[PDB]
Amino acid sequence: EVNSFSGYLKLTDNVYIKNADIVEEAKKVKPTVVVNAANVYLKHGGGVAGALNKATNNAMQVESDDYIATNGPLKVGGSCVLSGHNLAKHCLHVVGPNVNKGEDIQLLKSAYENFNQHEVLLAPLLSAGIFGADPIHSLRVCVDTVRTNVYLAVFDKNLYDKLVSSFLE
Ligand SMILES: CC(C)[C@H](Nc1ncnc2[nH]c(-c3ccc(=O)n(C)c3)cc12)c1ccc2c(c1)S(=O)(=O)CCC2
Questions:
Q1: Is the CB of 47 under 6 A from ligand 1?
Q2: With a 6 A CB cut-off, is 132 part of the ligand 1 pocket?
Q3: Domain Macro, which positions?
Q4: What angle separates helix 157-167 from helix 135-145, to the nearest 10 degrees?
């Protein structure tokens, strides 16, 4: 079965959300596209990006270093398409702003705009966690910006509940 997402809550006609680890979702679903919460040099050192790279047994990092050698770094708000390895057909590496490191929150709209080049995606909540954006704001930007079908995996039941309550106000 293709893109067999289960147990998601439909928020809008094109945005779905689940309390789940994106790595476990990718292994089960093998979506056409999994989004990585990347940085501009594609160094997958921790958090979501480190977890996805480890699930590929470091194949993602070697491919990412060869992409950077030939093409140079991404811009904040930008993206590139590389292999999905064992997790998906493709990985869309998207750079959201890191507000904790002084980057502009307005670039979160540009970051989500990359999703619109793909019909269906499994994705994390961009710029949340240690990137420092307000996660309720990130969900609002996602809902207002993405027009293709996005399945958001948020690996924290406390945050999941706060996000759904906020959306349903
Ligand atoms: C808000 C968080 C609950 C959310 N975390 C996550 N959301 C979805 N799937 C996840 N898997 C793991 C994980 C982490 C270690 C690990 O060994 N495994 C297996 C799995 C984390 C995780 C999240 C959303 C976006 C971003 C971050 C964190 S960050 O990595 O702090 C900075 C980049 C932006």
A1: yes
A2: no
A3: 2-169
A4: 50
